[PDB]
Design a protein around this nucleic acid. Structure first.
Ligand SMILES: *[C@@H]1O[C@H](CO)[C@@H](O[C@@H]2O[C@H](CO)[C@@H](O[C@@H]3O[C@H](CO[C@H]4O[C@H](CO)[C@@H](O)[C@H](O)[C@@H]4O[C@@H]4O[C@H](CO)[C@@H](O[C@@H]5O[C@H](CO[C@]6(C(=O)O)C[C@H](O)[C@@H](NC(C)=O)[C@H]([C@H](O)[C@H](O)CO)O6)[C@H](O)[C@H](O)[C@H]5O)[C@H](O)[C@H]4NC(C)=O)[C@@H](O)[C@H](O)[C@@H]3O)[C@H](O)[C@H]2NC(C)=O)[C@H](O)[C@H]1NC(C)=O
Ligand SMILES: *C[C@@](*)(O)[C@H](CCCNC(N)=[NH2+])NC(=O)[C@@H]1CCCN1C(=O)[C@H](N)Cc1ccccc1
Ligand code: NA
Ligand code: NA
Lengths: 33, 258
DNA sequence: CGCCTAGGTTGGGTAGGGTGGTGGCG
């Protein structure tokens, strides 16, 4: 069994949960265009 | 990680350190996909050609870390393994096809600001993000250079390293090496005349190659650091286990029991 | 006091830190 986490997976407590961007994620986003 | 930079705290809370009990040494990277399942590369656990064949007791998992060597008190969680499941068609005799493995923890771990699982990709996310030029992020405590030969600089970082790299066209991957590429792999990295550099290296294996979804702000693991020839060489690209193409196997194992 | 660099399943970044509870000096 998977266990807990799937619902909230991929959401970083110190970033996404706090509407905060790490210093480089923007770079990834920009590459998607 | 070669040509990366120190990771920010809690930047990659799914990062996991595969650690050897005796002697005490860091073996590989890995990623937390739930409270009890960890994903890594098979070759970290089993690679006969090198007399490598660890069983559950030989190892333990360290989650929520940042410093390579220190024991981060009241922060990192150290778990033991109940079972190791290596992809049954993992081809170690040749090109490391299906370089993937799951490890079940003895007891579920509690999440925190530093310990959080990453998402596995679905078909749509895989379809829209696995595109040449699109960048993912690789993290690890591996080497900063080719340590097997005299080279200037430190060998290992004090802290978890990180680097953003672009997925590369499959025909380019294939033409960059004599080793046989399979659909279950993909390469990433900058081209020679493309400005930036970067790559993973020995010790980063099992580490996640993640991408952030613009459609839901969730981080997804698209790959697993698998192999390369040298580190950060011009005309060479790091190879990664294609997690989505092995998603079926992953889900059979994880969902197999209550 | 205000500094200094420190064990531990662990460095020294400072005596808090993304975490306890801790010295010895001039
Ligand atoms: C890396 O290093 C590892 C070691 O770390 C090494 O592994 C060794 O490989 C060698 C050579 O390849 C191998 O040699 C063989 O030994 C065989 C003897 O078998 C047993 O050997 C030792 C002791 O003698 C045991 O400790 C082992 O457990 C082994 O016993 C079986 O192991 C198999 C394989 O994992 C198991 O099969 C799984 O079964 C699962 C479900 O099981 C059940 C079930 O119904 O639920 C489990 C139940 O408990 C059981 N019930 C009862 C009452 O017994 C039943 C029942 O046994 C029958 O199945 C029903 O009638 O089964 C599930 O189905 C899963 O799919 C199966 O894989 C199984 O648990 C064990 N069975 C038993 C009875 O114990 C020789 O016969 C053989 O000829 C060969 O020489 C070593 O055994 C092995 N050593 C170890 C420690 O693993 C790797 O080789 C190396 N890898 C590489 C790539 O280099
Ligand atoms: C186990 C991992 O730490 C490591 C990751 C290397 C990634 N390198 C780059 N540039 N991104 N993997 C390896 O070292 C693997 C395991 C065994 C050999 N190996 C290699 O990468 C060899 N250098 C090349 C290779 C040999 C045999 C089969 C596949 C690849
Ligand atoms: Na390169
Ligand atoms: Na301390």
């Amino acid at each position: 069994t998977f266990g807990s986490g799937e619902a909230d997976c991929g959401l970083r407590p110190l970033f996404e949960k706090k509407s905060l961007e790490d210093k480089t994620e923007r770079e990834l986003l920009e590459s998607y265009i | 990680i070669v040509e990366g930079s120190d990771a920010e705290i809690g930047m990659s809370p799914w990062q996991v350190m595969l650690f050897r009990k005796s002697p005490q040494e860091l073996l590989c990277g890995a990623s937390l996909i739930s409270d009890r399942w960890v994903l890594t590369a098979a070759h970290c656990l089993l690679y006969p050609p090198w007399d490598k064949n660890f069983t559950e007791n030989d190892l333990l998992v360290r989650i929520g870390k940042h410093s390579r060597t220190r024991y981060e008190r009241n922060i990192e969680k150290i778990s033991m393994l109940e079972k190791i499941y290596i992809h049954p068609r993992y081809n170690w005799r040749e090109n490391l096809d299906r370089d993937i493995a799951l490890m079940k923890l003895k007891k579920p771990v509690a999440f925190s600001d530093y310990i959080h699982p990453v998402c596995l990709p679905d078909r749509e996310t895989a379809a829209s993000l696995l595109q040449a030029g699109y960048k993912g992020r690789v993290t690890g405590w591996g080497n900063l250079k080719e340590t097997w030969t005299a080279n200037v600089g430190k060998g290992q970082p004090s802290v978890l390293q990180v680097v953003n790299l672009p997925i590369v066209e499959r025909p380019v991957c294939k033409d960059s090496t004599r080793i046989r590429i399979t659909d279950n792999m993909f390469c990433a990295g900058y081209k020679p005349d493309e400005g930036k550099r970067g790559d993973a290296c020995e010790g980063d294996s099992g580490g996640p190659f993640v991408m952030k979804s613009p459609f839901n702000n969730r981080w997804y693991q698209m790959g697993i650091v698998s192999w390369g020839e040298g580190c950060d060489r011009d005309g060479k690209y790091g190879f990664y286990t294609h997690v989505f193409r092995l998603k079926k196997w992953i889900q059979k194992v994880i969902d197999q029991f209550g």
